[PDB]
Paper text:
ATAs transfer an amino group of a chiral amine compound to a ketone compound using the cofactor pyridoxal 5’-phosphate (PLP) with a high turnover rate, stable catalytic activity, broad substrate specificity and excellent stereoselectivity, which is achieved by a proposed large-binding pocket (L pocket) and small-binding pocket (S pocket) in the substrate-binding site8910111213141516. Each protomer (subunit) of the dimeric enzymes shows a structural architecture typical of the fold-type IV class of PLP-dependent enzymes, which are made up of two domains. The substrate-binding site is surrounded by the cavity among the two domains, the cofactor PLP, and the loop consisting of the residues 129–145 of the other protomer. The substrate-binding site can be divided into two parts as described initially, the L pocket and the S pocket, which is consistent with the previously proposed mechanism for the substrate specificity of ATAs in which the smaller and larger atomic groups of substrates are recognized by the S and L pockets, respectively.
The [name] mutant was derived from structural comparison between Ab-R-ATA and ATA-117-Rd11, where the 136th residue was considered as the main cause of the structural alteration of the loop near the active site as will be described. The loops 129–145 of the [name] mutant and ATA-117-Rd11 showed significantly different conformation from that of the wild-type, depending on the amino acid residue at the position 136. Gly136 was located near Val152 in the wild-type, whereas Phe136 was distant from Val152 in the [name] mutant and ATA-117-Rd11, accompanied by the long-range alteration of the loop’s backbone conformation. This suggests that the probable steric hindrance between the bulky side chain of Phe136 and Val152 was the main cause of the conformational difference. The [name]/Y/H/W mutants show more than 40-fold lower kcat/Km values towards pyruvate, indicating that these mutants could not recognize pyruvate properly. This is probably due to the introduction of a bulky side chain into the residue 136, which could have altered the conformation of the loop 129–145, and thus caused Arg138, the key residue for pyruvate recognition, to move out from the active site. The alteration of the loop 129–145 varied the properties of the substrate binding site drastically. Simultaneously, Arg138 was moved away from the substrate-binding site by the alteration of the loop, resulting in an enlargement of the cavity to accommodate large substrates. These conclusions could well explain how the [name]/Y/H/W mutants favor bulky and hydrophobic substrates.
Numbering used by the authors:
A (entry chain B), B (entry chain A): 9 to 330
The structure:
Amino acid sequence: EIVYTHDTGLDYITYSDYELDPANPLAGGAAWIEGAFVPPSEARISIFDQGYLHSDVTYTVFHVWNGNAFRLDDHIERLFSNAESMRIIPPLTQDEVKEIALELVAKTELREAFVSVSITRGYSSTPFERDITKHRPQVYMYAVPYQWIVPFDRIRDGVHAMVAQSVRRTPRSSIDPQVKNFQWGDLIRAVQETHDRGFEAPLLLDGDGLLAEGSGFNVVVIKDGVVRSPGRAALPGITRKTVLEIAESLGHEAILADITLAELLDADEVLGCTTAGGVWPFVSVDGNPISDGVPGPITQSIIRRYWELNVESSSLLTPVQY
Amino acid sequence: EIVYTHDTGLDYITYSDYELDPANPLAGGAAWIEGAFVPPSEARISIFDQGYLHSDVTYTVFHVWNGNAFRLDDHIERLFSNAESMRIIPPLTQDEVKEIALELVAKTELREAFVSVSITRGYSSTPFERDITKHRPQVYMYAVPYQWIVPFDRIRDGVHAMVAQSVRRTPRSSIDPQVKNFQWGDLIRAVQETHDRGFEAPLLLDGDGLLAEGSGFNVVVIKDGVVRSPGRAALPGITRKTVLEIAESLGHEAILADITLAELLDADEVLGCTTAGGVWPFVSVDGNPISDGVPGPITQSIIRRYWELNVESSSLLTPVQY
Ligand SMILES: *Cc1c(COP(=O)(O)O)cnc(C)c1O
Ligand SMILES: *Cc1c(COP(=O)(O)O)cnc(C)c1O
């Protein structure tokens, strides 16, 4: 009943050839909550958790591909940095979190996986707790089959983006978008605007009217061989990071920068990236084509290379011990 | 073990004189989740609920005092209005929600209770669902003992406030603060700034530098007998609404308006209000006293009247059927 492979129609993206074990009750998906490994149907958290009642929680998502977790080190580092930005003291060490998460994946038997690790301020206290020692933070994880924000044919042919105008990306003076978080009020409004206006993906602007990010993904713009991505109102993504390293390795200048609306529209190429789906082209904005409306050459070589980095031996990869 | 009453030291606030049934496992605390009435230790929601993973959820909190719910219809009306603002279609009617919530309180036996009702977009889908009919929203409730945002002595003596400078209330163009929500990034940052600077409660400003609201409460400013409260960056509180009704009853003009920092500091009186604690004075701001730094006559009149409205038979009350 669980779907854990596809035929992708892409040479450079291939799932692993294997069968889940029917006698394993965590096969195909599972969670780690409060010290126990559980099936998805049991993956529940206290309604009193502040991560629910005040979204007082940060998180990351890493993926596993062909049995190796991608940049797990970077992910857990960011997670802990983000927790610290919120004054949340993780109850586990980074190495303990890595060990538990890898074992969680191991128990699902999943070779291609989406793994969420969230850390909340816990359910033993309220925001009005004067005594910070009373807080009891929780780590909650789950691992499920790799999820694609964008379909395979759209990785190959491109997506039609829209610049949201009913909403702007929450400012850092209210909620820091460089700390990964569950407070998606603005991102969901943008998705809803996408539905209303008949487009496929929202790109948001910041309060200064400059390019920010999308709904769960960063945006990258290419112009005369120079590869740029918003530095400010944008999560420092690990896919983005990888994309800029790829660009540099291909001979292109690659930088975080402020990008105007005009520059977005005038781009030779535009692309999107996030852990849940990888990298894909954006071939139009607001119904206007980007160049000739087909995925650009530099975009295609970044995509192919990103998927090669998922499979080549390197320090980017941590193998799961099934 | 459960604390459900207090000696308050205030003549106008008195808890009911009763004992819980020790043989009733829901006594003193319970939740309603997915059709089941449960004790607090079994009150859990799916971690895949978009109300956690994307804070895609609105709520309200109503209280029960001496066995009567206070302004229950305004609350559920507001909750359904807020849900509509988010395009969440409640899976129950307003009347069904009232019936369940009152039954929940009955089973707890609490005569003085805090009751949360939240509605999420549910766990059967993600924000990347093209087909919006596949969303299955969830209503989650809990009822626990009445919760006081400020201690009794500070209702009497007044609270020392602080205008936050490290943070602004989230703009309406990102997350609408007139829709009650769990996305407290900014509110919590304002509270943390309160710890850092050594004050008791935060008041935020909006992006225009005008008075917004507090972390879980509305602010009201009184000057030459005129009672004003921020109209824009502030939740339309049912407590606020009651305060202005009371204010009109006493002969004062009472309005929603834009309030400056300078007006805040020059006020004759300032107070705070919310469901979880009632009404209370703010006797200083950033260390500067408001007037003579003791609670003012109008505020004291409001507070006393609010507590009479919690007790006198009127259309504002709905009895719990114990
Ligand atoms: C997950 C996410 C990204 C991408 O981060 P990766 O580390 O590449 O997964 C970008 N923006 C937002 C808002 C996100 O939630
Ligand atoms: C709950 C709340 C209030 C007060 O609303 P009531 O209807 O009086 O409870 C004010 N501001 C915020 C941000 C809130 O969450």
